[PDB]
Amino acid sequence: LTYFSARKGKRKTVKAVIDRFLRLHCGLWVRRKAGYKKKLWKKTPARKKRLREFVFCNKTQSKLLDKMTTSFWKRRNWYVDDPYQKYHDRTNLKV
Amino acid sequence: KNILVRMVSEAGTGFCFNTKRNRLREKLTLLHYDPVVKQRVLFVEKKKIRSL
Amino acid sequence: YKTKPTHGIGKYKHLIKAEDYEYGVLNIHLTAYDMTLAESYAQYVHNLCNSLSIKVEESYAMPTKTILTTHERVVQISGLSATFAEIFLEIIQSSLPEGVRLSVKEHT
Amino acid sequence: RRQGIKKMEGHYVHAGNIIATQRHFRWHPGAHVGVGKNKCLYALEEGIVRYTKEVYVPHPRNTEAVDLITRLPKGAVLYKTFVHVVPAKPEGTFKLVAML
Amino acid sequence: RRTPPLGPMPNSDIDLSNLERLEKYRSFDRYRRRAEQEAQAPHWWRTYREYFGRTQQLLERKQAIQELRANVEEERAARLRTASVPLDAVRAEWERTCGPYHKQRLAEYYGLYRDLFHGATFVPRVPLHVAYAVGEDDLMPVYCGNEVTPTEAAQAPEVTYEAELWTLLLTSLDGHLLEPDAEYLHWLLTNIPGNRVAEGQVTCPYLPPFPARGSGIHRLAFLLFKQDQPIDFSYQLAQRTFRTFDFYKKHQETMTPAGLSFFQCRWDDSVTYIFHQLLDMREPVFEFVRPPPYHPKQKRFPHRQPLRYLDRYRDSHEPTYGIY
Amino acid sequence: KFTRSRIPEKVFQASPEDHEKYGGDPQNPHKLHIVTRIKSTRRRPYWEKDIIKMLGLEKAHTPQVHKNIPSVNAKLKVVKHLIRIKPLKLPQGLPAEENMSNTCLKSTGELVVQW
Amino acid sequence: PYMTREQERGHAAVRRREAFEAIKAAATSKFPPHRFIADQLDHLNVTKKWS
RNA sequence: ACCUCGGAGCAGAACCCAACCUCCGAGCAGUACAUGCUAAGACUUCACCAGUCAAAGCGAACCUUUGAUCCAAUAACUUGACCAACGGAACAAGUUACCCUAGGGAAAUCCUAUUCUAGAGUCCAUAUCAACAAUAGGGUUUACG
RNA sequence: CCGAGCCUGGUGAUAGCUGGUUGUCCAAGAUAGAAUCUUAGUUCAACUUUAAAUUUGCCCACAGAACCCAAAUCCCCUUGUAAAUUUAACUGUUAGUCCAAAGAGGAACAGCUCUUUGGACACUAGGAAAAAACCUUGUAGAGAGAGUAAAAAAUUUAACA
RNA sequence: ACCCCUAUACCUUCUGCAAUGAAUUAACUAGAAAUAACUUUGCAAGGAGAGCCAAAGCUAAGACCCCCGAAACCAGACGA
Ligand SMILES: [Mg+2]
Ligand SMILES: [Mg+2]
Ligand SMILES: [Mg+2]
Ligand SMILES: [Mg+2]
Ligand SMILES: [Mg+2]
Ligand SMILES: [Mg+2]
Ligand SMILES: [Mg+2]
Ligand SMILES: [Mg+2]
Ligand SMILES: [Mg+2]
Ligand SMILES: [Mg+2]
Ligand SMILES: [Mg+2]
Ligand SMILES: [Mg+2]
């Protein structure tokens, strides 16, 4: 990515990441499963159910996405009826 | 070979689902569960989606 | 498991066989005027064989021949002892009901 | 393929845990052990996993096994390895909710 | 390496080269019977059980059978598969002949022996009969393992038994509310003269069954003891609680159990009446509470898990806002 | 392949000739081993190296006292080609608290409470 | 062997538990050391002279 | 010729593995049209992607071989070709001794001589030569269409 | 100095390639799977380092793991032990060499090509003549003390009743 | 002093010794920085000298990302 832009000197965001991943504020990244819309007629119902799910990313995947986005995408957003408002925070987590 | 076809509900709903039928075989009419109506209803073949 | 004392506790194929003067293969041919009589005598001889523990392989029949028709039956037998063959044959002789032709012919 | 036993004898197992993955029926489901479509053995209860050898009585509809068992000598008994889950916790307890 | 078997391997005794000369299982049912026999038989390997465990009378019977067979009507009905059997007569005859053994089986299955005498068993020689009069016209019986509501058991039951003294006792093996092992006595007649029961010594007055709501199903036992010579004995739970074990230890020299009849009681409105009117206390309500579902330790990064993973560990479903 | 070696149990069944030769009574066996490492763990498998570390025999020729119990003996059996085992002999019994600081391990294997 | 495998079972369990308790205590007692005003102020002595 | 996947050899006893390699077949077919929806807990081709199993619950009835993203089309549900070099450049082959640069590197199957004597040697082995084998000595070749 | 002149500029072109990369001292520190227009590279994993939190971790005695029809391995009460897991941050190494062993590459003894188990080398010292891979042995300094480890090749034959 | 005994130059690249570089001296000649973290201050449900972040955070500082080298390509000049 661009660590220092030529016009502002700022770090840039890889917009391919924004078009694909949702960041929960605690540091979790949510994504869709690859192929979840592809050739559903030849997939078993269990496979389709697995593919239709919103899925968390690895620690290293999350670290990569954090590096590839800027701090703007990592802020608290108080959207009106955000479906992920409850998921934006972790509860009863030990280490 | 077989072709993937779009069985469209005869219950008036926009619900359609995809099946496979032989090209040489006659157009399909089949009982299937309608989620919107919550009842088994007839479905008719509308158009050929592809040729597999 | 191989190292355990219970090794081979589940083997079964050794219990399945899928494939001292004694006779060979014996064919008993029963030609009869009556289908019912021929069938009844075939049943009787088969019951005698499987009660005397005789290895019976086949109970088929020849095609009908017309020159009225005579029905033909075959009984396959293997395994005979010295006195056992005598008793078996004499019982057959004394139990032949009416006008039937026996045979002790061999294969081929 | 990475198949085989996932939980050996004595291992604590939670409901739903896959006990063994297999291509044939090397291990058979015992008590509180279910079978998936692919013959995988999973635990139906929470408890300890035990492996035993038990007499095998195939389902009558299993024509091949019935033929095998009818072609068998009069004294023989088939044996198979079975996997059981010995449940640990009780189904529940009765608790005083209210002194009306 | 190969460790030799620690005993006779199965299918080894019959392992012979004369397979063709060996009679086979022509049928599935004979193999099933043999397999059940083998399963019952003990083994040196690990098994599922390890973990989840007069002459004149004979002559009369033969003659009676001969007469019944000779009766042509009986043969015609049997061959026409239309004959029937007198259930009441069969019941009485079974009670006399081998009913006590079946009742001992029932008691062992219901755990009455293990819970009352710490495993010490006996046989109910006396075909006792108990029945709680419902209304006036009929009376619900108490067999070995019956099901009777506390409404029907509100008043003391009529007892009949063809015998000659007797001590009759009623316990609730599992109705206790404080101590798991103890049990409540409901009514106890002692020194019964022969068959008549109204003359019995009412040491502890009659109590109806009181199984708490949602507390399951309780088993109540009528015990009957043959008595050689009378002995002087001795609405509060502390005095209704007692253990049949040491109670019968204190009287086993002259008392011997010869009758049993037990039944199952559920909750009923009569139990509310019992708890309030005469026990004079708030009735306890119990609920069957299953253990909380197991979840693995929550991870910081629930890789490949669905979004529901976070819900599996959150406690409150209502939105929270922290410092804001 | 090279693997762990399973020593047959008959190897560790002493004979009366062995009893006479080495002077140990099978009845009333000795309580404690004195084990010294006398061979390098280099060019030995990692499991032997690990057992040596567990037993605390990293320094050669440095006696270490261990219990004569089946688990310790199993580890010692794993590394028996690298060590010398001699019974600990207590002619005056185990030392008392008074003379705990006046003991000495004689080369014969005897812990003497005078030194 | 002096003891059998059944006799030795659990005979050292108490000591092993106490030793691991000590290990856990050492592992969980890790924390930054104290800081003292005396240590901060003693640095002023780098310019201590003779009057 | 192959490149992906699956089954068998190929690994004797958890897994993993003999890559390269050998054989076979699949880019599906049949069936059903709840062969739905949801959901504890798990497995996993050693990463990820992806791929599996599944209790409980709800609802109907009463399963046995592959391909991502973007992009297109569809009101949408969903669908599509290419990606088969099958983790896939959207679309590009031959050739350079006219070349340049940056670097790197340099057992079987053959022959010779002894041994057994087969035997030639006029007959006769051992005057001479010599077969198959053995012994030595020298050289060539390899698991790969 | 022409298979395409020269100069200047873009230009500090680009280089997965070569070469180089400068005080002292201590410490931890090893071969390893996947994908890749990829095998002279990289990314993930594994390993590695630091910091942190917590509680178990390794070894393992039984018991246990299939029919078709060997050596061992897995799993864990003890026990010996003191580590392990998790959290945060992170580079670098990673398509090696040799030795012992078991196998495959056509029912191929050796040679090669691979797979697996283990060791060693890239790390000290002693020895085997010299000596990366064999044997002995390692945790660091000084001593004009001592006990040892491995460590020395063997062989000299033809009478005959 | 030598004679005695011990001792297979250095760097870099190879799995490891062969290969690379070095006449020698002096001078010059090569690790530049963010996303987070961590540490130490300040203040604290608030921090910050507008903007930004905040479910103990925020602000500030400290620590960390080399040098030389092609054949080339293009533009504009200069050259018979
Ligand atoms: Mg395969
Ligand atoms: Mg996996
Ligand atoms: Mg490709
Ligand atoms: Mg590819
Ligand atoms: Mg030319
Ligand atoms: Mg020129
Ligand atoms: Mg450059
Ligand atoms: Mg070091
Ligand atoms: Mg590609
Ligand atoms: Mg490269
Ligand atoms: Mg030079
Ligand atoms: Mg001119």
mmCIF file of C-alpha atoms in Angstrom, chain E residues 37-202:
data_model
loop_
_atom_site.group_PDB
_atom_site.id
_atom_site.type_symbol
_atom_site.label_atom_id
_atom_site.label_comp_id
_atom_site.label_asym_id
_atom_site.label_seq_id
_atom_site.Cartn_x
_atom_site.Cartn_y
_atom_site.Cartn_z
ATOM 1 C CA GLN E 37 -26.618 -65.599 24.700
ATOM 2 C CA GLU E 38 -23.019 -64.614 23.955
ATOM 3 C CA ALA E 39 -23.679 -61.011 24.984
ATOM 4 C CA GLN E 40 -25.099 -62.220 28.291
ATOM 5 C CA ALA E 41 -22.086 -64.480 28.798
ATOM 6 C CA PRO E 42 -19.148 -62.869 30.645
ATOM 7 C CA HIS E 43 -15.966 -62.125 28.735
ATOM 8 C CA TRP E 44 -12.354 -61.240 29.454
ATOM 9 C CA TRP E 45 -12.358 -58.239 27.095
ATOM 10 C CA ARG E 46 -13.912 -54.841 27.683
ATOM 11 C CA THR E 47 -17.657 -54.987 27.137
ATOM 12 C CA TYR E 48 -20.621 -52.641 27.256
ATOM 13 C CA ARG E 49 -21.821 -54.226 30.505
ATOM 14 C CA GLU E 50 -18.604 -53.319 32.340
ATOM 15 C CA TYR E 51 -19.339 -49.630 31.814
ATOM 16 C CA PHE E 52 -23.152 -49.533 31.730
ATOM 17 C CA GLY E 53 -24.005 -52.098 34.407
ATOM 18 C CA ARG E 54 -46.474 -80.939 44.622
ATOM 19 C CA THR E 55 -46.318 -84.225 42.726
ATOM 20 C CA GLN E 56 -50.082 -84.377 43.220
ATOM 21 C CA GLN E 57 -50.205 -80.836 41.833
ATOM 22 C CA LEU E 58 -48.253 -81.966 38.763
ATOM 23 C CA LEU E 59 -50.650 -84.871 38.227
ATOM 24 C CA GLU E 60 -53.655 -82.560 38.596
ATOM 25 C CA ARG E 61 -52.135 -80.120 36.101
ATOM 26 C CA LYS E 62 -51.553 -82.921 33.596
ATOM 27 C CA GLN E 63 -55.104 -84.236 33.998
ATOM 28 C CA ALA E 64 -56.596 -80.748 33.666
ATOM 29 C CA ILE E 65 -54.586 -80.110 30.497
ATOM 30 C CA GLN E 66 -55.758 -83.452 29.111
ATOM 31 C CA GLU E 67 -59.374 -82.507 29.851
ATOM 32 C CA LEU E 68 -59.001 -79.079 28.231
ATOM 33 C CA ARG E 69 -57.447 -80.634 25.126
ATOM 34 C CA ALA E 70 -60.156 -83.312 25.003
ATOM 35 C CA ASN E 71 -62.812 -80.584 25.050
ATOM 36 C CA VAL E 72 -63.554 -80.280 21.332
ATOM 37 C CA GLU E 73 -65.014 -76.777 21.698
ATOM 38 C CA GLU E 74 -61.666 -75.533 23.011
ATOM 39 C CA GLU E 75 -59.808 -77.091 20.076
ATOM 40 C CA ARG E 76 -62.293 -75.649 17.582
ATOM 41 C CA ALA E 77 -61.960 -72.168 19.080
ATOM 42 C CA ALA E 78 -58.157 -72.404 19.172
ATOM 43 C CA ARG E 79 -57.957 -73.573 15.553
ATOM 44 C CA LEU E 80 -60.392 -70.784 14.635
ATOM 45 C CA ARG E 81 -58.214 -68.322 16.632
ATOM 46 C CA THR E 82 -61.226 -67.042 18.548
ATOM 47 C CA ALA E 83 -60.786 -68.441 22.074
ATOM 48 C CA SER E 84 -60.174 -66.163 25.049
ATOM 49 C CA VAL E 85 -58.970 -66.433 28.649
ATOM 50 C CA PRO E 86 -60.538 -65.319 31.981
ATOM 51 C CA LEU E 87 -58.314 -62.429 33.027
ATOM 52 C CA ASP E 88 -59.604 -62.282 36.611
ATOM 53 C CA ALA E 89 -59.090 -66.003 37.199
ATOM 54 C CA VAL E 90 -55.615 -65.848 35.663
ATOM 55 C CA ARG E 91 -54.798 -62.849 37.859
ATOM 56 C CA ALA E 92 -55.885 -64.616 41.046
ATOM 57 C CA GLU E 93 -54.071 -67.826 40.119
ATOM 58 C CA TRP E 94 -50.872 -65.934 39.276
ATOM 59 C CA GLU E 95 -51.072 -63.975 42.535
ATOM 60 C CA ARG E 96 -51.307 -67.246 44.440
ATOM 61 C CA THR E 97 -48.663 -69.136 42.457
ATOM 62 C CA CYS E 98 -45.818 -66.876 41.312
ATOM 63 C CA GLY E 99 -47.046 -63.312 41.859
ATOM 64 C CA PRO E 100 -44.691 -62.754 44.821
ATOM 65 C CA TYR E 101 -41.640 -63.401 42.634
ATOM 66 C CA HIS E 102 -42.805 -60.904 40.014
ATOM 67 C CA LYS E 103 -43.545 -58.398 42.771
ATOM 68 C CA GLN E 104 -40.021 -58.901 44.117
ATOM 69 C CA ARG E 105 -38.722 -58.170 40.618
ATOM 70 C CA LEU E 106 -40.846 -55.020 40.521
ATOM 71 C CA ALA E 107 -39.567 -53.887 43.915
ATOM 72 C CA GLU E 108 -35.954 -54.473 42.890
ATOM 73 C CA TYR E 109 -36.502 -52.561 39.645
ATOM 74 C CA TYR E 110 -38.133 -49.676 41.512
ATOM 75 C CA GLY E 111 -35.263 -49.689 43.989
ATOM 76 C CA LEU E 112 -37.436 -50.216 47.056
ATOM 77 C CA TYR E 113 -35.064 -52.856 48.428
ATOM 78 C CA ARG E 114 -31.878 -50.844 47.897
ATOM 79 C CA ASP E 115 -33.449 -47.683 49.308
ATOM 80 C CA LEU E 116 -35.284 -49.208 52.294
ATOM 81 C CA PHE E 117 -33.085 -52.115 53.440
ATOM 82 C CA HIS E 118 -29.798 -51.087 51.768
ATOM 83 C CA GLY E 119 -30.148 -53.966 49.316
ATOM 84 C CA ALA E 120 -31.564 -56.604 51.658
ATOM 85 C CA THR E 121 -34.385 -58.320 49.780
ATOM 86 C CA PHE E 122 -37.334 -60.548 50.613
ATOM 87 C CA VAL E 123 -40.425 -61.986 48.932
ATOM 88 C CA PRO E 124 -43.976 -60.589 49.402
ATOM 89 C CA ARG E 125 -45.608 -63.853 50.428
ATOM 90 C CA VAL E 126 -48.962 -62.286 51.373
ATOM 91 C CA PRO E 127 -51.043 -61.160 48.352
ATOM 92 C CA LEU E 128 -51.918 -57.888 50.064
ATOM 93 C CA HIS E 129 -54.524 -55.579 48.546
ATOM 94 C CA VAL E 130 -54.838 -51.847 49.189
ATOM 95 C CA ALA E 131 -57.330 -49.496 47.591
ATOM 96 C CA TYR E 132 -58.107 -45.822 48.138
ATOM 97 C CA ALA E 133 -61.870 -45.311 48.167
ATOM 98 C CA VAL E 134 -62.701 -42.693 45.531
ATOM 99 C CA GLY E 135 -66.025 -41.075 46.306
ATOM 100 C CA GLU E 136 -68.248 -43.859 47.597
ATOM 101 C CA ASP E 137 -68.994 -46.150 44.656
ATOM 102 C CA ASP E 138 -65.474 -47.269 43.692
ATOM 103 C CA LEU E 139 -61.955 -47.605 45.065
ATOM 104 C CA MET E 140 -58.722 -47.130 43.128
ATOM 105 C CA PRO E 141 -56.394 -50.102 43.739
ATOM 106 C CA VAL E 142 -52.710 -49.948 44.636
ATOM 107 C CA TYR E 143 -50.818 -52.660 42.755
ATOM 108 C CA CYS E 144 -47.033 -53.102 42.596
ATOM 109 C CA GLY E 145 -46.147 -49.857 40.857
ATOM 110 C CA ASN E 146 -49.581 -48.322 40.329
ATOM 111 C CA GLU E 147 -50.300 -44.631 39.637
ATOM 112 C CA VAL E 148 -52.560 -42.835 42.130
ATOM 113 C CA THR E 149 -53.210 -39.116 42.560
ATOM 114 C CA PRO E 150 -53.014 -37.525 46.023
ATOM 115 C CA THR E 151 -56.640 -36.455 45.580
ATOM 116 C CA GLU E 152 -57.582 -40.131 45.403
ATOM 117 C CA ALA E 153 -55.144 -40.877 48.238
ATOM 118 C CA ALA E 154 -56.432 -38.062 50.472
ATOM 119 C CA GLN E 155 -58.210 -40.459 52.853
ATOM 120 C CA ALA E 156 -56.828 -43.674 54.303
ATOM 121 C CA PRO E 157 -57.247 -46.779 52.119
ATOM 122 C CA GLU E 158 -59.123 -50.026 52.609
ATOM 123 C CA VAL E 159 -56.770 -52.986 53.094
ATOM 124 C CA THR E 160 -57.718 -56.618 52.463
ATOM 125 C CA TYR E 161 -55.472 -59.668 52.650
ATOM 126 C CA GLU E 162 -56.368 -63.318 53.240
ATOM 127 C CA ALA E 163 -54.108 -64.166 56.176
ATOM 128 C CA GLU E 164 -54.034 -64.457 59.973
ATOM 129 C CA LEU E 165 -50.616 -60.410 63.781
ATOM 130 C CA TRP E 166 -49.769 -57.774 61.177
ATOM 131 C CA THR E 167 -48.059 -54.384 61.082
ATOM 132 C CA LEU E 168 -48.886 -52.183 58.089
ATOM 133 C CA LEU E 169 -46.726 -49.184 57.212
ATOM 134 C CA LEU E 170 -46.709 -46.495 54.529
ATOM 135 C CA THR E 171 -43.592 -44.615 53.442
ATOM 136 C CA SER E 172 -42.718 -42.088 50.749
ATOM 137 C CA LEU E 173 -39.298 -43.292 49.636
ATOM 138 C CA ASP E 174 -38.382 -39.991 47.975
ATOM 139 C CA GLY E 175 -40.743 -37.314 49.315
ATOM 140 C CA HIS E 176 -38.232 -35.850 51.759
ATOM 141 C CA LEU E 177 -37.553 -32.131 51.433
ATOM 142 C CA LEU E 178 -34.386 -31.730 53.533
ATOM 143 C CA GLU E 179 -32.377 -34.954 53.752
ATOM 144 C CA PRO E 180 -32.005 -37.044 50.577
ATOM 145 C CA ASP E 181 -31.752 -40.417 52.328
ATOM 146 C CA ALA E 182 -34.588 -40.012 54.834
ATOM 147 C CA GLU E 183 -38.265 -40.575 54.082
ATOM 148 C CA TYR E 184 -41.668 -39.664 55.494
ATOM 149 C CA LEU E 185 -44.038 -42.140 57.119
ATOM 150 C CA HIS E 186 -47.690 -41.519 56.301
ATOM 151 C CA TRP E 187 -49.616 -44.026 58.426
ATOM 152 C CA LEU E 188 -48.685 -47.072 60.478
ATOM 153 C CA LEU E 189 -51.068 -49.620 61.983
ATOM 154 C CA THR E 190 -49.567 -52.092 64.443
ATOM 155 C CA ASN E 191 -50.815 -55.284 66.095
ATOM 156 C CA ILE E 192 -53.541 -55.839 63.497
ATOM 157 C CA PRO E 193 -55.846 -58.623 64.750
ATOM 158 C CA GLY E 194 -56.038 -61.019 61.827
ATOM 159 C CA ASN E 195 -57.728 -59.348 58.861
ATOM 160 C CA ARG E 196 -59.708 -56.527 60.489
ATOM 161 C CA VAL E 197 -57.746 -53.281 60.307
ATOM 162 C CA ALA E 198 -59.905 -50.790 62.247
ATOM 163 C CA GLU E 199 -58.580 -52.309 65.493
ATOM 164 C CA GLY E 200 -54.949 -51.581 64.643
ATOM 165 C CA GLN E 201 -52.790 -49.408 66.873
ATOM 166 C CA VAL E 202 -52.602 -46.006 65.153
#
